[PDB]
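Table 4 source record.
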Amino acid sequence: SGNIFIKNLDKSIDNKALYDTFSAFGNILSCKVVCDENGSKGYGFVHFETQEAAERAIEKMNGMLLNDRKVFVGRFKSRKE
């Protein structure tokens, strides 16, 4: 799976800003910032076409500063072990 979640996003990041941050790593099928009645919930999803794209995204972006806030980036499903 090429699915990643991104946590601790600044709540001013919208879908287009998310796309712009992650489009570097591979072909994006979908991506969204999750929101409720009161706006962004501070996390997002990016669905890449490939697993390798997801791994490139994690390598570069996990723990990095997006605005004033370190983001976590992780796979939805981990590799077999």
